[PDB]
């Protein structure tokens, strides 16, 4: 069974759970506040920062390299733009770094530094979601918060170097499927993708609590 399939199958249950966190339920109904949107976007800033640091560290390592698509996919620069938009020119000292965000970053570093053959799980879990359901989430955010079609404040959701997310996502899958795979690696990769999903659920749980306090 192809890795791209193994991953989709292994994470379909947890994805349903992630969509139904209180925060994402509220987000999907169009109930997202500037305050809640800023918190999640600032948390993604840190998460993608760490993910992309580890991607760069491992760019030439054959357990990751077929997935090295910085120009098309990387989000740090977009998130920086969004932080300037939502937090102002001194955003770097204004943005929060929550404990659940710290926890996700810590695991990212563990993987990139000690278990790089698992880094595909983490890239799959964030980027493939961004290219599919993230585009739906984009449209809800825009409508909720009166964000302009010109894209300010939603740079994260915009892929100016990908013409067509569906076709790119098929390419990314195809390339995933060229990674050297043994039963060992495959089984652990799909386990780590479940953990990546859980780290996201735990973030959403935390942000909801911070918003309700």
Among candidates 108, 132, 129, which has minimal Cα distance to 192?
A: 108
Chain centroid to CA 196: how far?
9
User: Using CA atoms, how far apart are residues 178 and 163, in angstroms rounded to an integer?
Assistant: 23
Please give the C-alpha separations between residue 199 and each of 47, 62, 171, in angstroms, as whole numbers. Answer: 11, 26, 26
CB of 201 to ligand HEM, least distance (A): 7
- Count Cα atoms within 13 angstroms, Cβ side, for 200: 24
Q: In the set 66, 133, 151, 165, which binds ligand HEM (CB under 6 A)? A: 133
120 binds ligand HEM (CB under 6 A): no
177 binds ligand HEM (CB under 6 A): no
What would the two tokens of residue 51 be? 């993910």
Give whichever of 4 and 91 is closer to ligand HEM, judged by the CB atom. Answer: 4
Give whichever of 91 and 138 is closer to ligand HEM, judged by the CB atom. Answer: 138
Q: Give residue number: closest CB to ligand HEM.
A: 133
Give whichever of 112 and 129 is closer to ligand HEM, judged by the CB atom. Answer: 129
CB of 90 to ligand HEM, least distance (A): 29
User: Using CA atoms, how far apart are residues 100 and 40, in angstroms rounded to an integer?
Assistant: 11
Q: In the set 104, 124, 168, 172, which binds ligand HEM (CB under 6 A)? A: 124
Residue numbering of the annotated binding site:
8, 15, 124, 173
142 binds ligand HEM (CB under 6 A): no
User: Using CA atoms, how far apart are residues 144 and 122, in angstroms rounded to an integer?
Assistant: 29
Contact pattern for ligand HEM over residues 4 through 43, marking x by CB under 6 A: ---xx------x--xx----x--xx---------------
Residue numbering of the annotated binding site for heme b:
8, 15, 124, 173
What would the two tokens of residue 91 be? 């955003």
Please give the C-alpha separations between residue 176 and each of 14, 50, 133, 171, 210, in angstroms, as whole numbers. Answer: 21, 21, 20, 9, 37
The burial of 84, by beta-carbon neighbours within 10 Å (0-12 exposed, 13-18 middle, 19 or more buried), is given as: middle
Q: In the set 132, 164, 170, 178, which binds ligand HEM (CB under 6 A)? A: 132
Give whichever of 129 and 153 is closer to ligand HEM, judged by the CB atom. Answer: 129
Which residues are near ligand HEM by CB under 6 A?
7-8, 15, 18-19, 24, 27-28, 124-125, 128-129, 132-133, 136, 197, 200
């Amino acid at each position: 069974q192809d890795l791209s399939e193994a991953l989709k199958e292994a994470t379909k249950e947890v994805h349903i759970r992630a969509e139904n966190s209180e925060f994402m339920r509220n987000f999907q109904k169009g109930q997202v506040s500037r305050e809640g949107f800023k918190l999640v976007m600032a948390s993604l800033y840190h998460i993608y920062t760490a993910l992309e640091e580890e991607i760069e560290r491992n760019k030439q390592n054959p357990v990751y390299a077929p997935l090295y698509f910085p120009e098309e996919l990387h989000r740090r620069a977009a998130l920086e733009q969004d932080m300037a938009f939502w937090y102002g020119p001194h955003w770097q000292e204004a943005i929060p770094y929550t404990p659940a965000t710290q926890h996700y970053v810590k695991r990212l570093h563990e993987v990139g530094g000690t278990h790089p053959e698992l880094l595909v799980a983490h890239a799959y879990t964030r980027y493939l979601g961004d290219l599919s359901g993230g585009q739906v989430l984009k449209k809800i955010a825009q409508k909720a918060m009166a964000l302009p079609s010109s894209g300010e404040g939603l740079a994260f959701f915009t892929f100016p170097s990908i013409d067509n997310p569906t076709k790119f996502k098929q390419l990314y899958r195809a390339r995933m499927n060229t990674l050297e795979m043994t039963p060992e690696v495959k089984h652990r990769v799909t386990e780590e993708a479940k953990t990546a999903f859980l780290l996201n659920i735990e973030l959403f749980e935390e942000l909801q609590a911070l918003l309700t306090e």
